[PDB]
Write a protein that binds this DNA or RNA. Structure first.
Ligand code: GTP
Lengths: 285, 275, 166, 33, 300, 135, 246
RNA sequence: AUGGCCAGAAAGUGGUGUUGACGCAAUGUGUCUGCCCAGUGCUCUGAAUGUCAAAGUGAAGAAAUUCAACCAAGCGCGG
């Protein structure tokens, strides 16, 4: 029992295990002694607590690992949800150190956006998983109880699999709706997620030929600021040809200078001019 | 980085601390003027050092050392520093030269591995040469045991105070830097991280061609006179004009005073903006 | 059970001698050296000290052992390295006076002094691994062979030292 | 002998509607069967 | 790996007009995976033969291929056959590329049982006064190992002159020098010539008749005695070092020195240096009764 | 010393408690969640609100796992609600963004993405040092 | 010589000032302490101008230049531009540049002979910099920081860089620059060298929280306070830096 | 033990450690031994040719080249 602040779970065990069993409970706060229960004043996030729990387990393994804990709650519920998720993962890492093949591990997990990321850990580390939410838990509460059993017992476990950084790392950004940004640029689409890494200064330019040759013209229009006609350091003959064409009028050059102020008609005109130039240049279609 | 001053009463421990630091340690001619630990601070080679003045230790075993001198012993045992054992070649301290030797030998176990210096104070009264050869050997053979150095100083005329201070401070710095390098260098040969970062700060990059760059320093600064606030004939300065002409929030700055135009009368002109 | 630790530093042991009685010896898992359950007498209070030593080879239960500087130089007593003379086997010796024994606790090792240094008192002690060390004379040590035996199966040969050997 | 399966983690986390839709389409195909 | 090892084995069997036809042939086959070949003992027995029978261009290209991990070759238990054969043929560039990475890890390499003997023969055979010096400087303290020596003319490895320049380093350097020497003494590894050089500059710099001098002479005495005194007299610096030890030693020490000196009077007499220590021992010894009982009956 | 800036002029506050703003630094955080505003008054039912250059207390909702462990101070850098500067200019940005800053005023990151509001740059020299565009 | 001062109560001297070999720009605010510390060290050898840039007092991070030129962002007003021109002699060229990265002080570090710029700078801005400032322009990152103007202090004597700059990058920068470079801190461990110090060929002003070991390094690499201070004295005596920055 | 190993950016952070060279760790093994082949490349070593000295006396040395299946060694080894 990795967290028994009052000791209720230890008391429940002390009255239903088979005779001559072993139950050990650790907690940061002092616990009033319960008969047939071993009580620890040590913490859980310290490898000293690892050694002393080795000491009172002898060479024997462990069959069931219990975790029922929650940090201080009252700060926006975002800090509260994440800290509980990390505590669940650290309890899981402790269980992998002390549990026999086929053991059962049960954890209280607050339901949040990290709930699915922790469930994937027991999936790759155990054989059967399930969330229960017994009736005693308040219906208003977001708490849930996950039981993952059938522990595979590998020879060595990847530290990245137990590292909170690698499990709770946020997934990749989904592909932006370039069609919406081009075909409906007058919509608001409020941005609240952060900016990407590496595209600081929030500015990007390409050459006009790149817009001509690309397979995804919508992607370039919706993600770039300026389509440049500046002759490259070497000197592009296609830029010379595309600049001198009569299809590219003054209106075309105006739109290419400022892509972020364009509308529906302007974007369609750019796509039409791209198709006309591609026909001149002999591109497939 | 600490300098620890110990010795018999009335040898000049408090006078030495007052000389190098600004700690207000009483200096009086009686036996136990300093009844508690005093701390001073000095700067040497752009580093901060502590100087601790101790009450004083008599020639007794540790069992019946009273409360005052146990403050001396506790600092001697549990503080790693350079010990400055102040001796009295004369007998003005009220204790024999013999009793000072035995006291040093008795407390040497407390100096188990520290840097021990024996400084002979109050030598404006009677210096080393005016000693019988048997005593000179007894002082000398103390150095001829372990790593103890003997220095000579006088805290009344301030004759050997600075040289003793610099000598001890330099030796403390060398040993400490040696220890830091040793800790960074592990047994496997892998240089530690903190050592690696301090390597880059020592290193000075230099252009490979060995050519310098032209420096445009005017001739005027070469003949400038350093500004000093105690000089009656100093520069006027803008803050002094500010104080005489009001305060921080009352003085109004004339921003056109330093305008260099063609016709000086054109300053303080309302330049047209819109027509 | 309990770690094998010496008595705390005190005036009585460092200047006199104290009588103590052993009651039994207990084996504990994790090591082969048998612990010795001993009861001492407090010079200041009418209370018995419960401390555990390591049973050397040859001792029994029921000695009036002497703990101090001037104790009898017999097996079962402890003595500062200053008092014990040259060539004597010592076990469970102290690196410094106050660590309650650090060197030579496994089942059968011993340390023999090969020279005493009077002025600036230091005692030279040979380690079981064949190393040479110098320790303060004020340290204590258990006299005799620590129990456990089994010293006929120790292979002492090195690839490099053999090339070093003449 | 298990390691960090990066691609599997993305598949597990991103696909929840697709696995649900697969189950409903299978139950329907059972039912019509 | 199976076919690679198999085919090179046949080339190794042929080699252990036809000769150089193989060394290009084996090189092209072994081009790229040298680190694995120096790991395999059979391929280890292939390479030093190859370098011995290597054409002028081959030993350079393999050296650049071996550029990265010269130190790791020293720690490898099987690369001794190849690394010894790489050092014994004299060439000015190959001794200029072998030492720079050996530099700055002297303490670790000597502590390593197998590289310690490899670290000696490079020092004894081909090392020139510059790289010989700073390996000794690395022995004096960790400051010298990590830091490239300053613009001062004292770039040598003599304690007397470097400590004269900077007296404040007397205490730490001696402690480091004593600890490293004492650890190897307790390791019983005392057949290192560069160890004897460190011992000499240590004893020379001690003030006479000091307590630490008594500690050094006694700890030198304390051993089984059948090894350390014999090779230390065999070497150059130790032979003079032990001459001073007799001069500064006490009679009880001198009794122990000659008592350890036993049953090898034939061999050390034939050695060039160890008949200088008996040379000094003859005219500094006082106890003639033991002189006539030990050194003469085993001599005449 | 509470991190309430001094010398700040009155502007329209447009980020009340319980608002999400982007993160403009390279510290690993993407968005911040305002839960407290430094220097807020005490009036009934009024939600504390911040502005450009105002220290707030925020929690990282999405970003690097380390930054999600503790509540951080932050200085608002850009604001979508139009406000007026003393030169008579009503101006606004296209998003709400801030930077994680220690209680003294030192930025945790080393670079800022996007422009920095003039009020925030003038108030905090460290943000002014790590800014590329000031407008 | 190296001196310590604070603008109002902050040690970021580089934010509120700009020091060259021909002119000094000081922010305008409240008292006259910041102006007086600079004119106590520059007694009318070179002009000192009390200026504001774009209605701000952070002129240090908004302006860049050497003795031959000065550059200001596009948000600078005409009156603010006139104040600079009337204050400075005709041998210095002042140009207002229309660049997206308006914090010129953070994106340009320039001595008299060379300049380092933000990699994402415009090509037209690069051409103007080489013209007005009369230097050779290079695009570089200081310890993977694109704000070269804030993480490096430069003069014709030497240069400070970000404290965590690796050994190899110092060698490339020094050969590219032509002056010796050391990795150092300012204002008791701050990494923003440009924002926490200004320096020319004969004077540096840092914050009041700069430690004595740091001030010694600044003098040694910038050749100030007479003495010797070549930068080889930094390798000569090394116990303080190892003791203080370990 | 001012120690080794492991974690930790570091730590005056810890664990091992309630530990003291049998203890604590880390690398390799789970091909060993016996025999046979007109088996194998070499090192040491050995041979030959042509030279110039040789403490106011002792050793006879070195230079340059061609070389060596078996004819008392060794490093390796391969089937
Ligand atoms: N002549 C001479 N007298 C000294 C010198 N240094 C200290 N004294 C004398 O020492 C007396 C005071 O003793 P302290 O200097 O304070 O020595 P202490 O170790 O602190 O012992 P206390 O006397 O108890 O304070 C003064 O009256 C001085 O006369 C010195 O350098 N020369």
């Amino acid at each position: 029992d990795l967290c028994a602040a009052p000791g209720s779970w230890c008391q429940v065990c002390a009255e239903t295990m088979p005779k001559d069993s072993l139950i050990i409970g650790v907690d940061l706060a002092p616990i009033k002694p319960i008969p047939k229960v071993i009580t620890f004043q040590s913490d859980i996030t310290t490898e000293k607590c690892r050694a002393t729990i080795r000491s009172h387990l002898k060479t024997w393994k462990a069959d069931v690992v219990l975790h029922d804990g929650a940090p201080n709650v009252g700060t926006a519920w975002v800090q509260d949800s994440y800290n509980q998720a990390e505590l669940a993962l650290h309890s899981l890492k402790l269980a992998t150190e002390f549990l026999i093949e086929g053991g059962t591990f049960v954890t209280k997990v607050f339901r949040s956006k990290d709930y699915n990321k922790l469930l994937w850990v027991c999936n790759q580390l155990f054989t059967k998983v399930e969330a229960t939410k017994p009736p005693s838990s308040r219906n208003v509460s977001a708490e849930i109880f996950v039981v993952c059993r059938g522990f595979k017992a590998p020879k060595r476990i990847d530290p990245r699999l137990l590292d909170p950084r690698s499990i709770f790392e946020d997934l990749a950004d989904p592909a932006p709706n370039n069609e919406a940004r081009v075909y409906n640029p007058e919509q608001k689409k409020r941005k609240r997620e952060g900016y990407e890494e590496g595209d600081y200064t929030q500015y990007k330019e390409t050459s006009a030929i790149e817009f001509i040759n690309t397979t995804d013209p919508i992607a370039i229009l919706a993600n770039y600021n300026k389509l440049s006609f500046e002759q490259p350091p070497n000197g592009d003959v296609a830029l010379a040809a595309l600049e001198k064409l009569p299809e590219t009028t003054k209106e075309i050059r105006a739109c290419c200078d400022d892509l972020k102020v364009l509308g529906k008609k302007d974007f369609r005109l750019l796509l039409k001019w791209r198709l006309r130039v591609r026909e001149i240049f002999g591109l497939p279609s | 980085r600490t300098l620890l001053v110990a010795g018999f009463p009335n040898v000049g421990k408090s006078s030495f601390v007052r000389s190098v630091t600004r700690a207000d340690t009483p200096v009086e001619p009686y036996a136990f003027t300093t009844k508690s630990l005093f701390v001073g601070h000095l700067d040497y080679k752009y580093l901060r050092y502590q100087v601790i003045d101790t009450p004083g230790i008599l020639d007794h075993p540790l069992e019946e050392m009273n409360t005052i001198e146990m403050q001396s012993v506790t600092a001697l045992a549990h503080l790693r520093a350079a010990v400055l054992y102040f001796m009295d070649i004369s007998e003005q301290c009220g204790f024999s030269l013999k009793a000072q030797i035995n006291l040093f030998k008795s407390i040497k176990p407390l100096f188990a591995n520290k840097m021990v210096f024996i400084v002979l104070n109050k030598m404006d009264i009677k210096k080393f040469e005016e000693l019988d050869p048997e005593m000179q050997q007894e002082i000398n053979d103390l150095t001829k045991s372990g790593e103890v150095e003997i220095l000579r100083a006088s805290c009344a005329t301030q004759e050997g105070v600075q040289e003793v201070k610099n000598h001890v401070c330099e030796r403390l710095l060398v040993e400490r830097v040696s220890q830091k390098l040793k800790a960074g260098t592990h047994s496997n040969g892998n240089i530690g991280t903190r050592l690696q970062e301090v390597m880059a700060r020592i290193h000075v990059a230099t252009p490979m061609d060995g050519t310098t760059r032209e420096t445009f320093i005017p001739e005027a600064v070469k003949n400038l006179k350093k500004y000093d606030k105690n000089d009656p004939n100093r520069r006027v300065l803008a803050r002094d004009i500010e104080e005489a002409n009001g305060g921080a929030g009352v003085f109004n700055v004339d921003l056109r005073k330093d305008w260099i135009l063609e016709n000086p009368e054109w300053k303080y002109d309302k330049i047209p903006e819109i027509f | 059970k309990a770690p094998a630790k010496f008595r705390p530093l005190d005036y009585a042991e460092r200047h006199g001698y104290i009588r103590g009685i052993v009651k039994e010896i207990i084996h504990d898992p994790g090591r082969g050296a048998p612990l010795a359950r001993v009861v001492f007498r407090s010079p200041y209070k009418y209370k018995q000290i419960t401390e555990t030593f390591i049973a050397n080879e040859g001792m029994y239960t029921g000695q009036f052992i002497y703990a101090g500087k001037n104790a009898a130089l017999t097996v079962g007593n402890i003595l500062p390295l200053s008092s014990v003379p040259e060539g004597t086997v010592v076990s469970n010796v102290e690196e410094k006076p106050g660590d309650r024994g650090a060197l030579g606790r496994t089942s059968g090792n011993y340390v023999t002094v090969v020279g005493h240094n009077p002025d600036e008192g230091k005692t030279r002690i040979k380690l079981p691994s064949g190393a040479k060390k110098v320790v303060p004379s004020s340290s204590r040590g258990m006299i005799g062979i620590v129990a456990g035996g089994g010293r006929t199966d120790k292979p002492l040969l090195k690839a490099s030292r053999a090339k070093h050997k003449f | 002998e298990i390691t960090f399966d990066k691609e599997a983690r993305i598949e597990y986390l991103t696909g929840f509607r697709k696995r649900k839709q697969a189950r409903i389409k299978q139950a329907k195909e059972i039912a019509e069967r | 790996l199976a076919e690679e090892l198999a085919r090179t084995k046949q080339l190794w069997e042929t080699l252990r007009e036809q000769r150089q036809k193989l060394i290009e042939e084996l090189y092209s086959i072994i081009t790229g995976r040298i680190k694995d070949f120096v790991l395999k003992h059979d391929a280890v027995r292939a390479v030093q033969t190859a370098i011995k029978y290597a054409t002028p261009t081959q030993r350079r290209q393999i050296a650049k291929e071996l550029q990265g991990s010269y130190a790791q070759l020293a720690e490898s238990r099987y690369a001794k056959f190849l690394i010894a054969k790489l050092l014994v043929q004299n060439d000015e560039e190959i001794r200029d590329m072998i030492i720079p990475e050996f530099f700055g890890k002297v303490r670790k390499l000597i502590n390593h049982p197998e590289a310690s003997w490899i670290l000696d023969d490079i020092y004894r055979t081909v090392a020139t006064k510059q790289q010989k010096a700073q390996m000794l400087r690395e022995w004096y303290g960790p400051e010298f190992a990590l830091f490239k020596p300053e613009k001062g003319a004292e770039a040598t490895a003599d304690l007397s002159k470097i400590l004269a320049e900077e007296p404040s380093k007397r205490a730490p350097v001696l402690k480091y020098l004593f600890d490293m020497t004492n650890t190897l003494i307790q390791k019983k590894m005392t057949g290192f010539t560069m160890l004897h050089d460190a011992m000499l500059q240590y004893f020379l710099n001690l003030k006479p008749e000091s307590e630490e001098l008594k500690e050094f002479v006694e700890v030198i005495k304390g051993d089984e005695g059948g090894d350390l005194l014999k090779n230390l007299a065999f070497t150059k610096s130790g032979a003079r070092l032990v001459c001073l030890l007799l001069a500064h030693g006490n009679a009880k020490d001198r009794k122990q020195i000659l008592k350890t000196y036993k049953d090898t009077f034939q061999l050390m007499c034939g050695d060039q240096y160890a008949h200088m220590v008996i040379l000094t021992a003859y005219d500094v010894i006082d106890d003639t009764v033991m002189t006539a009982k030990t050194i003469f009956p085993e001599l005449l | 010393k509470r991190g309430a800036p001094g010398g700040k002029l009155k502007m329209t506050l447009g980020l009340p408690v319980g608002a999400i703003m982007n993160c403009a630094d390279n510290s690993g955080a993407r968005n911040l969640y305002i839960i407290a505003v430094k220097g807020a008054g005490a009036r009934l039912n009024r939600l504390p609100a911040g502005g450009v250059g105002d220290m707030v207390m925020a929690t990282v909702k999405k970003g690097k796992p380390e930054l999600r462990k503790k509540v951080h101070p932050a200085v608002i850098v850009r604001q979508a609600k139009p406000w007026k500067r003393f030169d008579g200019v009503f101006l606004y940005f296209e998003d709400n963004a801030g930077v994680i800053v220690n209680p003294k005023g030192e930025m945790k990151g080393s670079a800022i993405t996007g422009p920095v509001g003039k009020e925030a740059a003038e108030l905090w020299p460290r943000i002014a040092s790590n800014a590329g565009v000031v407008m | 010589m190296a001196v310590r001062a604070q603008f109002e109560n902050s040690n970021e001297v580089g934010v509120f000032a700009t020091l060259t070999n021909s002119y000094c720009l000081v922010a305008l605010g409240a008292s006259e302490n910041f102006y007086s510390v600079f004119e106590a060290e520059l007694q009318d050898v070179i002009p000192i101008c009390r200026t504001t840039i774009a209605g701000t007092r952070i002129i240090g991070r908004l302006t860049a230049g050497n003795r031959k030129g000065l550059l200001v962002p596009t948000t600078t007003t005409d009156q603010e531009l006139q104040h600079l021109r009337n204050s400075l002699p005709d041998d210095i060229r002042i140009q207002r540049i229309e660049e997206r990265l308006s914090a010129l002080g953070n994106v340009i570090v320039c001595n008299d002979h060379t300049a380092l710029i933000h990699p994402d700078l415009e090509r037209e801005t690069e051409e103007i910099i080489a013209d007005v400032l009369g230097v050779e322009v290079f695009r570089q990152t200081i310890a993977d920081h694109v704000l070269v103007g804030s993480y490096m202090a430069l003069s014709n004597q030497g240069g400070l860089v970000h404290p965590k700059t690796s050994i190899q990058d110092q060698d490339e920068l020094s050969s590219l620059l032509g002056v010796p470079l050391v990795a150092g801190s300012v204002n008791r461990g701050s990494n923003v060298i440009g924002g926490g110090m200004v320096v020319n060929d004969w004077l540096a002003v840092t914050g009041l929280d700069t430690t004595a070991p740091e001030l010694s390094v600044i003098e040694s690499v910038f050749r100030l306070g007479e003495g010797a201070g070549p930068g080889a004295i930094n390798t000569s005596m090394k116990n303080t830096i190892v003791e203080s920055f370990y």
